[PDB]
Design a protein around this ligand. Structure first.
Ligand code: HEM
Ligand code: HEM
Ligand SMILES: Nc1cccc(CNCCOc2cccc(OCc3ccc4ccc(N)nc4c3)c2)n1
Ligand SMILES: Nc1cccc(CNCCOc2cccc(OCc3ccc4ccc(N)nc4c3)c2)n1
Ligand SMILES: C[C@H](O)[C@H](O)[C@H]1CNc2nc(N)[nH]c(=O)c2N1
Ligand SMILES: C[C@H](O)[C@H](O)[C@H]1CNc2nc(N)[nH]c(=O)c2N1
Ligand SMILES: [Zn+2]
Lengths: 411, 411
C-alpha cells in the first residue's frame, strides 16, 4: 500500500505515500475505473466542520514546523470555540495564503503546478457589492497582466454562509469572447460562450456582434441579482496571431487574450467554501491553438487554414488536419513570444511537470496527477508525461467544480 | 444500477449496464485511481465456477440458455474437471472465446472488427517445429499478399505450469536491436534484450538495422528453439514521402503484419499462454511510437534536420512538424504498396460507432481512454471528447511474465 509509479521512457520509479493522506473519493471502485469521466461527485452542519478545520490546521502547523506547539494547540482551541458559537470560523491571512497555494498544489489536472508556491493571493473577504467585486477584479487583472510579464494570482471573496448569500462570478473566465448564433446556420465568435453571451444580452449588454467581442463581467455579491460591468480595454492584453513563415496567416484576422483567468470554481479550505475565487496564470500554447481554435464545437478553423495551405483535404489519411494543427500552434507561440507576452509550449510545460513530480515525490512523498488531463491534446507521446505513470487522488485544500449560478439563483 | 457516459463534443449520452457483469478487479479504489498504471497454477477448486460462468455466456449468445444441450455440457465439464482437474473447450467454444477476448479488450481501438477473426486451432501441437509450421501458416493467411486478415492461432492450454507453450518473441515479426560498445544502438532499441537471447541461443545475427528476428518457440515446457521465418512470408514496405524525395534516403522500412505473441488468453478459467494474434496497423503505431519514441528508432532529429527546421528551441515545434511528416510517409508508403493500414482519424471514428453500437446491443463497451486516444493530435479525434468506462470482462487477453524470467532450463 506504498504505491509505485514508473516512467517507461527512463525506468525512474517513485514511491507514493502522500495518497494515504487522501480524504475525498475518486469515483472509481475495484470493479470500474471512472478516470475519463469529466465530473463525478447545502450548508455544512456544525458537526463535520470541526474535523475539517482540525485536519487543515494540523497540516498548516506541520508546514511551519510547529506541530503540537503552544501556538498550534491554542489556535486549534480558538477555532474550536468559534465554531461552537458562530457555527463557522474565519481563517487568518497566513492560513488563507497557505490554503490557496495548496489548492493549486493539489490540483491533479494542472500541468503548471511547478509554480504553485509563487502565487499572489488577494484577500477580498471585506467585499460587499458587485461594484466592489468589479474593483477587486480589475486590480487582479492589472496585477496579473503586468504588461505581458504575467504573474499568477487569485482573488478570494467572502466564504459561503447559508447558501442564500453566495458570491459568484458568473463568467467561466474573467476574459472570454462572445458567441452569437446566426439566423441561418453557423456561429459567430466563440460557440462555447453562446448561452452566456445570450444571458448577458438578455440582461442589458449591447453586443457589438463581432468575432472577438470581450464579454462583460456578470458579478453576484451576497446572493443578489448579478450586475454587468465592462472590463476597461486597456486592461485586456491581446495578441494578434501571425505565422513566422506564412504571410497570409495575418490575413485570417485572429487574436487571443493574454490572461487565462478561471472564475467559476470553488475553493475549499478547512471545510470553508469560497464560491468566488477567480485565479489566473499564463497560457500553454495548445490551450488556444489546439482546443480554442480547432475543437469542432469551438472556433473550428482547421478547414480554412488547410485550404490556404493548399493541402489535399479529400481524405483523412493525408493528415491535413495534423499539419494545419501544428502550424496554428507554431503561430500562437510565435505571436505571444514576439509581443513579449508570457506563454509556455507543451514540450516545456510537460518537462517542467516531470521535474515538479520528482520534487514533490522527494520533498512531499507524492504528487496527485490526472494523466487524462496532464498529457497535452497534441503530440502526446513525444512529450515526457505520456510515458509517466501517475496516481490520481483528492487532497484538500482543493478547487472544485460548482453548478452554473443561473441554474440555482432565485431571480 | 445504471451508469452514464457523455460525449462532450456531441452531447450524446449512453447508459452502461454491462459493467455489472464485471468479475475481475481494476486496481482502482474509492480513494485512488490507477488508470494510468501500465499494469496494475489454477486448481480444480476455483475452476468450475469459471467454466460455468463462461458456458452460461456462451449458451446465452447462441440463444440456448437453459437448454438440454446447455445443461448436458455443464454436467460434462463438471465431471471432466473433478476427474481430470481441467477440461477441454469445444471448437465452437474456443472460437467464441477468442472473439470475445478481443471484443473485451478495453485498450484496443480496432474492435469494430472483433467478430471477423479467423481462429486457428493449434491445440494438437506438440513440438516447437510444429509451432513453427502453425505460425508460418498464420503469417501467410494473415498477410494475404497485403490484403490483411485478422487471425489468431491457439496452442495447447496450460496444465501444471511446468509444460507451458510460449512464443518467446513479443511479436511474430520484429527487427533486431544491437547495443554497440560505444553505447549506441543499431536497429530497434526495443528489441535489444530479446536479440541478445537469440544470439545466445545460437542465432547468427546479420547485425543490420532491419534484421527480422528469428522465432524462439517453446513447446510443452521444453527449452525454446530457433526458427527463421521464410523471408517471402515477411511482407515489408519501404518508407518514402509523397513530397520529400530525400525521405527514401533515410533507408527506413517496416513490416506489414502486426502480430502480438506474448499475451495470455483466458477462456472459462483455461489459460492459453501461446496465442499469437494479428490484425493490421494503425499508422501512428509505426510513425509516432516505433520511429519517434526517444527509446526507439528516434529519427525525429534527422527528419527535422533534412527539413531544415529551427531545432534551437522547442517552441518552434520542430518535433511536432517532423512527427506529422513521418506519419504521412508511413501511411503513403503502405497505401502505395496496397498493404492494409488505417489512419488514426478513421480508426477513432470507427471506434465511436463501434462503442455506440455496443451500448445498444450489449449494454456497454469497456474502454481505456489512456490507450484509445491516439499518441498524436489527440483532441482532433472524436475519442478525446468521449467519456469511457473501464472494467474487466472475461474471456480476456492478459499480460504475463516474459518466459526467460520464469523458465526452468533443461540443458
Ligand atoms: C501559471 C501557469 C499555469 C499553466 C501553464 C497551467 C496549465 C493548465 C492546463 C493546460 C490545464 C488544463 C485545462 C484545460 O485543458 O482546459 C490546467 C488545469 C487546471 N489548472 Fe493550471 N495552469 C497554470 C496555473 C494555474 C493556477 C495559478 C491555478 C490556481 C491557482 C491553476 C489551477 C488549475 C486547475 C484547478 C485546473 C483543473 C481544473 C479542473 O479540474 O477542471 N492553474 N492548468
Ligand atoms: C484489426 C486491426 C486492429 C487495429 C487497428 C488495432 C489497434 C490497436 C492499437 C493501436 C492498440 C494500442 C497499441 C499500442 O499502442 O501498443 C491496440 C491494443 C490491443 N489490441 Fe488491437 N488492433 C487490431 C486488432 C486486434 C486483434 C485481431 C486483436 C486480438 C485478437 C487485438 C487485441 C488487442 C489487445 C489485447 C490490445 C491491448 C494491448 C495491451 O493491453 O497491451 N487487436 N489495438
Ligand atoms: N464544462 C464544459 C461545458 C461544455 C464544454 C466543455 C469543454 N470540455 C472541458 C472544458 O475545459 C475546462 C474544464 C474545466 C476547467 C477548465 O479550466 C481549468 C484551468 C484552470 C486554470 C488554468 C490556469 C492557467 C491556464 N493556462 N489554464 C488553466 C485552465 C477548462 N466544458
Ligand atoms: N516492456 C517495456 C520495456 C521498456 C519499454 C517499454 C515501452 N512500452 C511499450 C508499450 O507497447 C506495447 C505494450 C503492450 C502491448 C502492445 O501492443 C498491443 C497491441 C496488441 C494487438 C494489436 C493488434 C493490431 C495492432 N495494429 N496493434 C496491436 C497492438 C504494445 N516496454
Ligand atoms: C504511462 C502510460 O500509462 C503509458 O505510457 C501508456 C500511455 N498510453 C498508451 N497508449 C497506447 N495506445 N499505447 C501505449 O503504449 C501507451 N502507453
Ligand atoms: C472525455 C474526456 O474526459 C474529456 O474530453 C477531457 C479529456 N482530457 C482533457 N484534458 C484537458 N487538458 N482538458 C480537457 O478539457 C479534457 N477533456
Ligand atoms: Zn480509476
Amino acid at each position: 500500500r506504498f504505491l509505485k509509479v514508473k516512467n517507461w521512457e527512463t525506468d525512474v520509479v517513485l514511491t507514493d505515500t502522500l495518497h494515504l493522506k487522501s480524504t475525498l473519493e475518486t469515483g472509481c471502485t475495484e470493479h470500474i475505473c471512472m478516470g475519463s469521466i469529466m465530473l463525478p461527485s447545502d450548508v455544512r452542519t456544525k458537526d463535520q466542520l470541526f474535523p475539517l478545520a482540525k485536519e487543515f490546521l494540523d497540516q498548516y502547523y506541520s508546514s511551519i514546523k510547529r506541530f503540537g506547539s503552544k501556538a498550534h494547540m491554542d489556535r486549534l482551541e480558538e477555532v474550536n470555540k468559534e465554531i461552537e458559537s458562530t457555527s463557522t470560523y474565519q481563517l487568518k491571512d497566513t492560513e488563507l495564503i497557505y490554503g490557496a497555494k495548496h489548492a493549486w498544489r493539489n490540483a491533479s489536472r494542472c500541468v503548471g503546478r511547478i509554480q504553485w508556491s509563487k502565487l499572489q493571493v488577494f484577500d477580498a473577504r471585506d467585499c460587499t457589492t458587485a461594484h466592489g467585486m468589479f474593483n477587486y477584479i480589475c486590480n487582479h487583472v492589472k496585477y496579473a497582466t503586468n504588461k505581458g510579464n504575467l504573474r499568477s494570482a487569485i482573488t478570494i471573496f467572502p466564504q459561503r454562509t447559508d447558501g442564500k448569500h453566495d458570491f459568484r462570478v458568473w463568467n467561466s473566465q474573467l476574459i472570454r469572447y462572445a458567441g452569437y448564433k446566426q439566423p441561418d446556420g453557423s456561429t459567430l465568435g466563440d460557440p462555447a460562450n453562446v448561452q452566456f453571451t445570450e444571458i448577458c444580452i438578455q440582461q442589458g449588454w449591447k453586443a457589438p456582434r463581432g468575432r472577438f467581442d470581450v464579454l462583460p463581467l456578470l458579478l453576484q455579491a451576497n446572493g443578489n441579482d448579478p450586475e454587468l460591468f465592462q472590463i476597461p480595454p486597456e486592461l485586456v492584453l491581446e495578441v494578434p496571431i501571425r505565422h513566422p513563415k506564412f504571410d497570409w496567416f495575418k490575413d485570417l484576422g485572429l487574436k487571443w487574450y493574454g490572461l487565462p483567468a478561471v472564475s467559476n470554481m470553488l475553493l475549499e479550505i478547512g471545510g470553508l467554501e469560497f464560491s468566488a475565487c477567480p485565479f489566473s496564470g499564463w497560457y500553454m500554447g495548445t490551450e488556444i491553438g489546439v482546443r480554442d481554435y480547432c475543437d469542432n464545437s469551438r472556433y473550428n478553423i482547421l478547414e480554412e487554414v488547410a485550404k490556404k495551405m493548399d493541402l489535399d483535404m479529400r481524405k483523412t489519411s493525408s493528415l491535413w488536419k495534423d499539419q494545419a494543427l501544428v502550424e496554428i500552434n507554431i503561430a500562437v507561440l510565435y505571436s505571444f513570444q514576439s509581443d513579449k507576452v508570457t506563454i509556455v509550449d507543451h514540450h516545456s510545460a510537460t518537462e517542467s511537470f516531470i521535474k515538479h513530480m520528482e520534487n514533490e515525490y522527494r520533498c512531499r512523498g507524492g504528487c496527485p496527477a490526472d494523466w487524462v488531463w496532464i498529457v497535452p491534446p497534441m503530440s502526446g507521446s513525444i512529450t515526457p508525461v505520456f510515458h509517466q505513470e501517475m496516481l490520481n487522488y483528492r487532497l484538500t485544500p482543493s478547487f472544485e467544480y460548482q453548478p452554473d449560478p443561473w441554474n440555482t439563483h432565485v431571480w
